[PDB]
mmCIF file of C-alpha atoms in Angstrom:
data_model
loop_
_atom_site.group_PDB
_atom_site.id
_atom_site.type_symbol
_atom_site.label_atom_id
_atom_site.label_comp_id
_atom_site.label_asym_id
_atom_site.label_seq_id
_atom_site.Cartn_x
_atom_site.Cartn_y
_atom_site.Cartn_z
ATOM 1 C CA UNK A 1 0.000 0.000 0.000
ATOM 2 C CA UNK A 2 1.166 3.526 -0.808
ATOM 3 C CA UNK A 3 -0.125 4.845 2.526
ATOM 4 C CA UNK A 4 2.143 2.526 4.512
ATOM 5 C CA UNK A 5 4.842 3.173 1.904
ATOM 6 C CA UNK A 6 4.960 6.920 2.553
ATOM 7 C CA UNK A 7 4.154 6.719 6.272
ATOM 8 C CA UNK A 8 7.749 7.120 7.568
ATOM 9 C CA UNK A 9 8.739 10.013 5.308
ATOM 10 C CA UNK A 10 5.695 12.164 6.071
ATOM 11 C CA UNK A 11 6.265 12.015 9.829
ATOM 12 C CA UNK A 12 9.983 12.734 9.461
ATOM 13 C CA UNK A 13 9.282 15.627 7.071
ATOM 14 C CA UNK A 14 7.330 17.482 9.777
ATOM 15 C CA UNK A 15 9.135 20.674 10.779
ATOM 16 C CA UNK A 16 9.700 21.846 14.352
ATOM 17 C CA UNK A 17 10.234 25.433 15.592
ATOM 18 C CA UNK A 18 13.975 25.960 15.949
ATOM 19 C CA UNK A 19 16.323 28.844 16.730
ATOM 20 C CA UNK A 20 19.681 29.340 14.971
ATOM 21 C CA UNK A 21 21.472 28.689 18.272
ATOM 22 C CA UNK A 22 19.530 25.442 18.720
ATOM 23 C CA UNK A 23 20.515 24.525 15.159
ATOM 24 C CA UNK A 24 24.178 25.158 15.993
ATOM 25 C CA UNK A 25 23.746 22.984 19.092
ATOM 26 C CA UNK A 26 22.344 20.150 16.971
ATOM 27 C CA UNK A 27 25.116 20.592 14.394
ATOM 28 C CA UNK A 28 27.960 20.504 16.929
ATOM 29 C CA UNK A 29 26.402 17.560 18.790
ATOM 30 C CA UNK A 30 25.991 15.557 15.578
ATOM 31 C CA UNK A 31 29.539 16.472 14.525
ATOM 32 C CA UNK A 32 31.025 15.335 17.843
ATOM 33 C CA UNK A 33 29.038 12.080 17.828
ATOM 34 C CA UNK A 34 30.103 11.421 14.233
ATOM 35 C CA UNK A 35 33.786 12.080 14.959
ATOM 36 C CA UNK A 36 33.607 9.797 17.998
ATOM 37 C CA UNK A 37 31.933 6.994 16.037
ATOM 38 C CA UNK A 38 34.408 7.412 13.165
ATOM 39 C CA UNK A 39 37.402 7.171 15.495
ATOM 40 C CA UNK A 40 35.756 4.101 17.038
ATOM 41 C CA UNK A 41 34.905 2.430 13.709
ATOM 42 C CA UNK A 42 38.278 3.377 12.125
ATOM 43 C CA UNK A 43 36.825 5.696 9.489
ATOM 44 C CA UNK A 44 38.987 8.656 8.518
ATOM 45 C CA UNK A 45 36.809 11.738 8.079
ATOM 46 C CA UNK A 46 37.789 15.245 7.008
ATOM 47 C CA UNK A 47 36.446 18.329 8.757
ATOM 48 C CA UNK A 48 34.422 19.418 5.721
ATOM 49 C CA UNK A 49 32.800 15.978 5.802
ATOM 50 C CA UNK A 50 32.307 16.053 9.577
ATOM 51 C CA UNK A 51 30.419 19.347 9.313
ATOM 52 C CA UNK A 52 27.818 17.483 7.194
ATOM 53 C CA UNK A 53 27.910 20.242 4.591
ATOM 54 C CA UNK A 54 26.998 22.912 7.161
ATOM 55 C CA UNK A 55 30.512 24.333 7.560
ATOM 56 C CA UNK A 56 29.143 27.782 6.659
ATOM 57 C CA UNK A 57 27.333 27.641 10.026
ATOM 58 C CA UNK A 58 30.326 26.564 12.126
ATOM 59 C CA UNK A 59 30.762 30.192 13.242
ATOM 60 C CA UNK A 60 27.989 32.246 11.620
ATOM 61 C CA UNK A 61 24.493 31.349 12.787
ATOM 62 C CA UNK A 62 21.850 30.742 10.090
ATOM 63 C CA UNK A 63 18.830 32.916 9.386
ATOM 64 C CA UNK A 64 15.767 32.753 11.616
ATOM 65 C CA UNK A 65 13.392 31.704 8.828
ATOM 66 C CA UNK A 66 15.538 28.858 7.447
ATOM 67 C CA UNK A 67 16.117 27.263 10.859
ATOM 68 C CA UNK A 68 13.428 24.563 10.700
ATOM 69 C CA UNK A 69 14.243 23.471 7.145
ATOM 70 C CA UNK A 70 17.986 23.433 7.855
ATOM 71 C CA UNK A 71 17.326 21.395 10.993
ATOM 72 C CA UNK A 72 15.320 18.819 9.055
ATOM 73 C CA UNK A 73 18.030 18.609 6.394
ATOM 74 C CA UNK A 74 20.673 18.227 9.111
ATOM 75 C CA UNK A 75 18.707 15.394 10.731
ATOM 76 C CA UNK A 76 18.387 13.622 7.381
ATOM 77 C CA UNK A 77 22.057 14.060 6.463
ATOM 78 C CA UNK A 78 23.148 12.884 9.917
ATOM 79 C CA UNK A 79 20.992 9.757 9.653
ATOM 80 C CA UNK A 80 22.342 9.030 6.161
ATOM 81 C CA UNK A 81 25.972 9.508 7.210
ATOM 82 C CA UNK A 82 25.469 7.251 10.239
ATOM 83 C CA UNK A 83 23.906 4.560 8.044
ATOM 84 C CA UNK A 84 26.951 4.879 5.780
ATOM 85 C CA UNK A 85 29.399 4.688 8.694
ATOM 86 C CA UNK A 86 27.640 1.481 9.757
ATOM 87 C CA UNK A 87 28.757 -0.038 6.423
ATOM 88 C CA UNK A 88 32.472 -0.241 7.200
ATOM 89 C CA UNK A 89 33.829 2.376 4.813
ATOM 90 C CA UNK A 90 37.428 3.540 5.098
ATOM 91 C CA UNK A 91 37.209 7.293 4.456
ATOM 92 C CA UNK A 92 34.664 10.114 4.208
ATOM 93 C CA UNK A 93 36.275 12.512 1.734
ATOM 94 C CA UNK A 94 33.568 15.113 1.045
ATOM 95 C CA UNK A 95 30.021 15.963 2.137
ATOM 96 C CA UNK A 96 28.958 18.980 0.060
ATOM 97 C CA UNK A 97 25.508 20.533 0.503
ATOM 98 C CA UNK A 98 24.475 23.462 -1.727
ATOM 99 C CA UNK A 99 22.649 26.248 0.070
ATOM 100 C CA UNK A 100 18.861 26.205 -0.139
ATOM 101 C CA UNK A 101 16.975 29.252 -1.466
ATOM 102 C CA UNK A 102 15.483 29.812 1.994
ATOM 103 C CA UNK A 103 18.973 30.517 3.367
ATOM 104 C CA UNK A 104 19.780 33.449 1.072
ATOM 105 C CA UNK A 105 17.340 36.359 1.749
ATOM 106 C CA UNK A 106 4.614 26.295 -2.671
ATOM 107 C CA UNK A 107 5.158 22.875 -4.233
ATOM 108 C CA UNK A 108 3.987 19.686 -2.470
ATOM 109 C CA UNK A 109 7.670 18.874 -1.812
ATOM 110 C CA UNK A 110 11.149 20.384 -1.954
ATOM 111 C CA UNK A 111 14.301 18.701 -3.295
ATOM 112 C CA UNK A 112 17.558 19.316 -1.444
ATOM 113 C CA UNK A 113 20.794 18.505 -3.298
ATOM 114 C CA UNK A 114 23.714 16.814 -1.583
ATOM 115 C CA UNK A 115 27.033 15.420 -2.812
ATOM 116 C CA UNK A 116 28.841 12.858 -0.671
ATOM 117 C CA UNK A 117 32.128 11.114 -1.407
ATOM 118 C CA UNK A 118 33.612 8.097 0.342
ATOM 119 C CA UNK A 119 36.353 5.541 -0.175
ATOM 120 C CA UNK A 120 36.601 1.893 0.775
ATOM 121 C CA UNK A 121 36.650 -1.700 -0.356
ATOM 122 C CA UNK A 122 34.073 -2.867 -2.873
ATOM 123 C CA UNK A 123 31.971 -4.709 -0.283
ATOM 124 C CA UNK A 124 31.598 -1.728 2.048
ATOM 125 C CA UNK A 125 30.942 0.582 -0.913
ATOM 126 C CA UNK A 126 28.145 -1.655 -2.209
ATOM 127 C CA UNK A 127 26.732 -1.827 1.323
ATOM 128 C CA UNK A 128 26.818 1.983 1.433
ATOM 129 C CA UNK A 129 24.966 2.075 -1.895
ATOM 130 C CA UNK A 130 22.320 -0.243 -0.449
ATOM 131 C CA UNK A 131 22.123 1.925 2.680
ATOM 132 C CA UNK A 132 21.543 5.070 0.603
ATOM 133 C CA UNK A 133 18.866 3.239 -1.379
ATOM 134 C CA UNK A 134 17.101 1.485 1.497
ATOM 135 C CA UNK A 135 16.733 4.164 4.177
ATOM 136 C CA UNK A 136 13.130 4.109 5.379
ATOM 137 C CA UNK A 137 13.040 7.335 7.418
ATOM 138 C CA UNK A 138 14.328 9.758 4.749
ATOM 139 C CA UNK A 139 13.806 9.524 0.979
ATOM 140 C CA UNK A 140 17.189 9.876 -0.743
ATOM 141 C CA UNK A 141 17.111 9.502 -4.533
ATOM 142 C CA UNK A 142 20.358 8.770 -6.382
ATOM 143 C CA UNK A 143 20.788 11.356 -9.138
ATOM 144 C CA UNK A 144 24.371 10.547 -10.122
ATOM 145 C CA UNK A 145 27.248 8.206 -9.291
ATOM 146 C CA UNK A 146 30.968 8.530 -10.039
ATOM 147 C CA UNK A 147 33.366 5.632 -9.454
ATOM 148 C CA UNK A 148 37.167 5.794 -9.539
ATOM 149 C CA UNK A 149 39.765 3.036 -9.172
ATOM 150 C CA UNK A 150 43.404 3.018 -8.083
ATOM 151 C CA UNK A 151 46.599 2.455 -10.043
ATOM 152 C CA UNK A 152 47.090 -1.223 -9.172
ATOM 153 C CA UNK A 153 43.646 -2.725 -9.022
ATOM 154 C CA UNK A 154 43.604 -5.998 -10.984
ATOM 155 C CA UNK A 155 40.794 -6.426 -13.521
ATOM 156 C CA UNK A 156 38.387 -9.315 -12.875
ATOM 157 C CA UNK A 157 39.912 -12.765 -13.291
ATOM 158 C CA UNK A 158 38.783 -14.780 -16.311
ATOM 159 C CA UNK A 159 21.929 -2.815 -10.502
ATOM 160 C CA UNK A 160 24.212 -3.812 -7.635
ATOM 161 C CA UNK A 161 25.392 -6.786 -9.716
ATOM 162 C CA UNK A 162 26.088 -4.544 -12.730
ATOM 163 C CA UNK A 163 28.458 -1.914 -11.297
ATOM 164 C CA UNK A 164 30.376 -4.501 -9.254
ATOM 165 C CA UNK A 165 32.983 -5.312 -11.973
ATOM 166 C CA UNK A 166 33.317 -1.535 -12.430
ATOM 167 C CA UNK A 167 34.857 -1.276 -8.941
ATOM 168 C CA UNK A 168 38.231 -2.356 -7.645
ATOM 169 C CA UNK A 169 38.110 -5.082 -5.032
ATOM 170 C CA UNK A 170 40.572 -3.603 -2.522
ATOM 171 C CA UNK A 171 39.716 0.115 -2.586
ATOM 172 C CA UNK A 172 37.341 2.198 -4.697
ATOM 173 C CA UNK A 173 36.332 5.869 -4.497
ATOM 174 C CA UNK A 174 32.633 6.666 -4.923
ATOM 175 C CA UNK A 175 30.921 10.060 -5.170
ATOM 176 C CA UNK A 176 27.111 10.091 -5.053
ATOM 177 C CA UNK A 177 24.932 13.102 -5.871
ATOM 178 C CA UNK A 178 21.550 12.755 -4.140
ATOM 179 C CA UNK A 179 18.308 14.714 -3.735
ATOM 180 C CA UNK A 180 16.633 14.535 -0.337
ATOM 181 C CA UNK A 181 12.850 14.887 -0.651
ATOM 182 C CA UNK A 182 11.165 17.039 2.005
ATOM 183 C CA UNK A 183 7.397 16.626 1.840
ATOM 184 C CA UNK A 184 5.436 19.876 2.158
ATOM 185 C CA UNK A 185 1.692 20.385 2.463
ATOM 186 C CA UNK A 186 0.228 19.043 -0.815
ATOM 187 C CA UNK A 187 -2.471 21.667 -1.411
ATOM 188 C CA UNK B 1 50.445 -16.564 -13.252
ATOM 189 C CA UNK B 2 49.325 -13.588 -15.324
ATOM 190 C CA UNK B 3 48.793 -15.841 -18.354
ATOM 191 C CA UNK B 4 46.379 -18.277 -16.698
ATOM 192 C CA UNK B 5 44.213 -15.511 -15.215
ATOM 193 C CA UNK B 6 43.890 -13.418 -18.407
ATOM 194 C CA UNK B 7 44.279 -16.332 -20.862
ATOM 195 C CA UNK B 8 41.375 -15.511 -23.270
ATOM 196 C CA UNK B 9 42.638 -11.952 -23.914
ATOM 197 C CA UNK B 10 46.195 -13.008 -24.841
ATOM 198 C CA UNK B 11 45.462 -14.232 -28.381
ATOM 199 C CA UNK B 12 43.974 -10.969 -29.692
ATOM 200 C CA UNK B 13 46.992 -8.910 -28.545
ATOM 201 C CA UNK B 14 49.247 -10.385 -31.252
ATOM 202 C CA UNK B 15 50.281 -7.653 -33.687
ATOM 203 C CA UNK B 16 50.076 -7.915 -37.474
ATOM 204 C CA UNK B 17 52.236 -6.054 -40.032
ATOM 205 C CA UNK B 18 50.215 -3.084 -41.256
ATOM 206 C CA UNK B 19 50.839 -0.050 -43.450
ATOM 207 C CA UNK B 20 49.442 3.408 -42.622
ATOM 208 C CA UNK B 21 47.300 3.297 -45.773
ATOM 209 C CA UNK B 22 45.969 -0.149 -44.839
ATOM 210 C CA UNK B 23 45.153 1.204 -41.379
ATOM 211 C CA UNK B 24 43.308 4.155 -42.921
ATOM 212 C CA UNK B 25 41.349 1.775 -45.159
ATOM 213 C CA UNK B 26 40.416 -0.437 -42.197
ATOM 214 C CA UNK B 27 39.390 2.650 -40.209
ATOM 215 C CA UNK B 28 37.173 3.999 -42.993
ATOM 216 C CA UNK B 29 35.557 0.581 -43.468
ATOM 217 C CA UNK B 30 34.828 0.223 -39.751
ATOM 218 C CA UNK B 31 33.433 3.767 -39.680
ATOM 219 C CA UNK B 32 31.112 3.110 -42.628
ATOM 220 C CA UNK B 33 29.921 -0.196 -41.166
ATOM 221 C CA UNK B 34 29.325 1.482 -37.799
ATOM 222 C CA UNK B 35 27.347 4.367 -39.317
ATOM 223 C CA UNK B 36 25.271 1.891 -41.331
ATOM 224 C CA UNK B 37 24.572 -0.283 -38.281
ATOM 225 C CA UNK B 38 23.652 2.764 -36.186
ATOM 226 C CA UNK B 39 21.261 4.103 -38.826
ATOM 227 C CA UNK B 40 19.692 0.640 -39.075
ATOM 228 C CA UNK B 41 19.450 0.133 -35.296
ATOM 229 C CA UNK B 42 18.173 3.724 -34.840
ATOM 230 C CA UNK B 43 21.137 4.858 -32.731
ATOM 231 C CA UNK B 44 22.231 8.468 -33.179
ATOM 232 C CA UNK B 45 26.004 8.832 -33.499
ATOM 233 C CA UNK B 46 28.013 12.025 -33.917
ATOM 234 C CA UNK B 47 30.777 12.429 -36.481
ATOM 235 C CA UNK B 48 33.558 12.508 -33.879
ATOM 236 C CA UNK B 49 32.225 9.245 -32.424
ATOM 237 C CA UNK B 50 31.987 7.441 -35.773
ATOM 238 C CA UNK B 51 35.748 7.827 -36.291
ATOM 239 C CA UNK B 52 36.287 5.647 -33.175
ATOM 240 C CA UNK B 53 38.730 8.200 -31.766
ATOM 241 C CA UNK B 54 41.019 8.038 -34.821
ATOM 242 C CA UNK B 55 39.809 11.266 -36.454
ATOM 243 C CA UNK B 56 43.410 12.538 -36.599
ATOM 244 C CA UNK B 57 44.038 9.830 -39.213
ATOM 245 C CA UNK B 58 40.994 10.624 -41.362
ATOM 246 C CA UNK B 59 43.261 12.506 -43.793
ATOM 247 C CA UNK B 60 46.870 12.154 -42.598
ATOM 248 C CA UNK B 61 48.134 8.582 -42.477
ATOM 249 C CA UNK B 62 49.751 7.440 -39.205
ATOM 250 C CA UNK B 63 53.418 6.680 -38.686
ATOM 251 C CA UNK B 64 54.897 3.441 -39.991
ATOM 252 C CA UNK B 65 56.082 2.224 -36.588
ATOM 253 C CA UNK B 66 52.744 2.779 -34.814
ATOM 254 C CA UNK B 67 50.644 1.201 -37.582
ATOM 255 C CA UNK B 68 50.367 -2.295 -36.074
ATOM 256 C CA UNK B 69 49.615 -0.998 -32.574
ATOM 257 C CA UNK B 70 46.983 1.386 -33.942
ATOM 258 C CA UNK B 71 45.464 -1.504 -35.885
ATOM 259 C CA UNK B 72 45.186 -3.572 -32.710
ATOM 260 C CA UNK B 73 43.639 -0.657 -30.817
ATOM 261 C CA UNK B 74 41.205 -0.003 -33.679
ATOM 262 C CA UNK B 75 40.136 -3.658 -33.747
ATOM 263 C CA UNK B 76 39.528 -3.579 -29.990
ATOM 264 C CA UNK B 77 37.595 -0.297 -30.039
ATOM 265 C CA UNK B 78 35.508 -1.447 -33.014
ATOM 266 C CA UNK B 79 34.580 -4.700 -31.267
ATOM 267 C CA UNK B 80 33.674 -2.795 -28.094
ATOM 268 C CA UNK B 81 31.539 -0.209 -29.902
ATOM 269 C CA UNK B 82 29.718 -2.899 -31.892
ATOM 270 C CA UNK B 83 29.035 -4.852 -28.693
ATOM 271 C CA UNK B 84 27.599 -1.627 -27.263
ATOM 272 C CA UNK B 85 25.467 -0.923 -30.345
ATOM 273 C CA UNK B 86 23.991 -4.419 -30.031
ATOM 274 C CA UNK B 87 22.462 -3.313 -26.694
ATOM 275 C CA UNK B 88 19.837 -0.918 -28.055
ATOM 276 C CA UNK B 89 21.180 2.396 -26.786
ATOM 277 C CA UNK B 90 19.805 5.687 -28.090
ATOM 278 C CA UNK B 91 22.944 7.804 -28.618
ATOM 279 C CA UNK B 92 26.725 7.501 -28.920
ATOM 280 C CA UNK B 93 27.908 10.874 -27.627
ATOM 281 C CA UNK B 94 31.713 10.613 -27.538
ATOM 282 C CA UNK B 95 34.498 8.127 -28.282
ATOM 283 C CA UNK B 96 37.734 9.919 -27.350
ATOM 284 C CA UNK B 97 41.122 8.204 -27.665
ATOM 285 C CA UNK B 98 44.291 9.995 -26.506
ATOM 286 C CA UNK B 99 47.252 9.371 -28.776
ATOM 287 C CA UNK B 100 49.633 6.617 -27.741
ATOM 288 C CA UNK B 101 53.322 7.445 -27.178
ATOM 289 C CA UNK B 102 54.267 5.215 -30.126
ATOM 290 C CA UNK B 103 52.358 7.606 -32.412
ATOM 291 C CA UNK B 104 54.483 10.650 -31.587
ATOM 292 C CA UNK B 105 57.973 10.114 -33.088
ATOM 293 C CA UNK B 106 59.426 11.499 -29.847
ATOM 294 C CA UNK B 107 59.713 -3.652 -21.572
ATOM 295 C CA UNK B 108 56.590 -3.598 -19.415
ATOM 296 C CA UNK B 109 54.509 -6.779 -18.935
ATOM 297 C CA UNK B 110 51.590 -4.988 -20.636
ATOM 298 C CA UNK B 111 50.746 -1.678 -22.273
ATOM 299 C CA UNK B 112 47.702 0.383 -21.225
ATOM 300 C CA UNK B 113 45.739 2.293 -23.852
ATOM 301 C CA UNK B 114 43.350 4.994 -22.614
ATOM 302 C CA UNK B 115 39.850 5.353 -24.004
ATOM 303 C CA UNK B 116 36.829 7.482 -23.102
ATOM 304 C CA UNK B 117 33.384 6.428 -24.319
ATOM 305 C CA UNK B 118 30.058 8.117 -23.641
ATOM 306 C CA UNK B 119 26.582 6.852 -24.458
ATOM 307 C CA UNK B 120 22.976 7.698 -23.670
ATOM 308 C CA UNK B 121 19.833 5.607 -23.411
ATOM 309 C CA UNK B 122 17.183 4.083 -21.203
ATOM 310 C CA UNK B 123 18.211 2.207 -18.066
ATOM 311 C CA UNK B 124 17.714 -1.239 -19.626
ATOM 312 C CA UNK B 125 19.952 -0.565 -22.630
ATOM 313 C CA UNK B 126 22.494 1.141 -20.357
ATOM 314 C CA UNK B 127 22.703 -1.929 -18.109
ATOM 315 C CA UNK B 128 23.013 -4.115 -21.210
ATOM 316 C CA UNK B 129 25.912 -1.945 -22.407
ATOM 317 C CA UNK B 130 27.602 -2.120 -18.999
ATOM 318 C CA UNK B 131 27.332 -5.916 -19.013
ATOM 319 C CA UNK B 132 28.681 -5.972 -22.576
ATOM 320 C CA UNK B 133 31.723 -3.936 -21.528
ATOM 321 C CA UNK B 134 32.100 -6.307 -18.572
ATOM 322 C CA UNK B 135 31.700 -9.563 -20.486
ATOM 323 C CA UNK B 136 33.987 -9.021 -23.487
ATOM 324 C CA UNK B 137 36.176 -12.091 -23.982
ATOM 325 C CA UNK B 138 38.411 -10.884 -26.840
ATOM 326 C CA UNK B 139 39.856 -7.632 -25.443
ATOM 327 C CA UNK B 140 40.548 -6.737 -21.815
ATOM 328 C CA UNK B 141 39.000 -3.351 -21.036
ATOM 329 C CA UNK B 142 39.689 -2.256 -17.463
ATOM 330 C CA UNK B 143 37.373 0.276 -15.850
ATOM 331 C CA UNK B 144 39.369 3.276 -14.682
ATOM 332 C CA UNK B 145 36.291 5.406 -13.987
ATOM 333 C CA UNK B 146 32.554 5.482 -14.700
ATOM 334 C CA UNK B 147 30.063 8.341 -14.286
ATOM 335 C CA UNK B 148 26.273 7.977 -14.552
ATOM 336 C CA UNK B 149 23.754 10.833 -14.851
ATOM 337 C CA UNK B 150 19.967 10.889 -15.180
ATOM 338 C CA UNK B 151 19.841 14.297 -16.934
ATOM 339 C CA UNK B 152 16.491 15.595 -15.669
ATOM 340 C CA UNK B 153 16.969 15.633 -11.898
ATOM 341 C CA UNK B 154 14.897 13.076 -9.957
ATOM 342 C CA UNK B 155 12.256 13.705 -8.937
ATOM 343 C CA UNK B 156 13.893 8.430 -18.878
ATOM 344 C CA UNK B 157 17.221 8.925 -20.633
ATOM 345 C CA UNK B 158 20.461 8.128 -18.798
ATOM 346 C CA UNK B 159 23.998 9.226 -19.699
ATOM 347 C CA UNK B 160 27.021 7.019 -18.990
ATOM 348 C CA UNK B 161 30.652 8.073 -19.483
ATOM 349 C CA UNK B 162 33.291 5.368 -19.017
ATOM 350 C CA UNK B 163 37.053 5.905 -18.930
ATOM 351 C CA UNK B 164 38.704 2.567 -19.738
ATOM 352 C CA UNK B 165 42.214 1.181 -20.160
ATOM 353 C CA UNK B 166 42.622 -1.412 -22.896
ATOM 354 C CA UNK B 167 45.328 -3.917 -21.944
ATOM 355 C CA UNK B 168 47.748 -4.942 -24.700
ATOM 356 C CA UNK B 169 49.778 -8.029 -23.796
ATOM 357 C CA UNK B 170 53.222 -7.979 -25.402
ATOM 358 C CA UNK B 171 55.802 -10.732 -25.812
#
C-alpha cells in the first residue's frame, strides 16, 4: 500500500520550531558524535565531511526563517551519514551541501541537493549504496554516481550486480549526488 | 600466473604487419559499417564518435612504426563499440582516444591504452551496455572510472561516461 509506503517520510518531514542557536547545538552535537563513532569504527573523516555540509554555520548562525528546514536537512544528512558509517567504509572525503533558497534572503515537496564522497573496499561501498537506497526514514534519490579506481587494481579474473565489476576489489572511491525529498503540504 | 588468469585476452593482442594506408582503409571501413549499423538500429552517433577516436588519421596517415599498434587498438575499439550498439542504446555521444606514445615520433609486462566512451539511453539498454563492456572475452577493457547521470533531476534517458584502459599483452 502507498499509505504505509509513505508513512515514515511524512512524519519525518514534519518541521519543528527551531532557533539558529539550537541549530548550531544540533550541528555541533551531531559532529562530535560522528567524529567519535568514526574514530571508534576506524573511518577517517575530514572536517568538511564532519560538518555534514553545514561548515558555513560553524561560526555564523543561520537565518531565523531557514532554521526549521535546515534542521530537518541536518537530521536527514546525519541519519544518512550514520547509516553509511555502519557499512564499514574507510574514508569520508567530502560531504557537500548546496545552500537552499530559503537561506539566502509552494510545491507539495522540496528537493535538497547533496554530494557525498567516500572511499573503501568494494563490499563496504556496495553496502553503502544499499544503505543510501534502502533508508526508510528519509527519501534519498540517487541522481548521479561517479566511481574511480586506483593504479594497481587488478581487472576481474577470467543494478548492484552490474556496477560490481566496475569497482576495484581492494579500494574504490565513490561520489554520489543525491536529492533529499522534504514533503510539504500538498495543497 | 598472469597468463592463466587473463588467458582468453592473450590471443587478440598479437600484432600484425600493417601499413598506414591499410590502417586508414580499415578505419574507414569500420566507420562506414558502424554508421550503417547505427542508422539501421536507430542509434544516433556524432561524427567525432563514428571515427572511433582516430579522427586525426581521417586525412593524414599514421606513422609506420605505430601502424600495427593502432590496428590492434582499432580492432579492440571497433569490437567494443559494436558490442555496445547491439544493446539498443539511443545515442553515442563521444568516443575519445588519446594518442599513444608510439604515435608521436618522440619492456613492461603490458601496455595500457586509454579510451573514453560516452553513451545515452534508457536504463535497460544502459545496463546491457555495462554488461557488454564487462563480459567481453576478446579484449581486456579495465574500468578506470565510470560516471552515470539521469539528466532531468529526480524527482527516462540516462547518460554514462566510461574511462577505460585497454590492456595490450606484449611478448
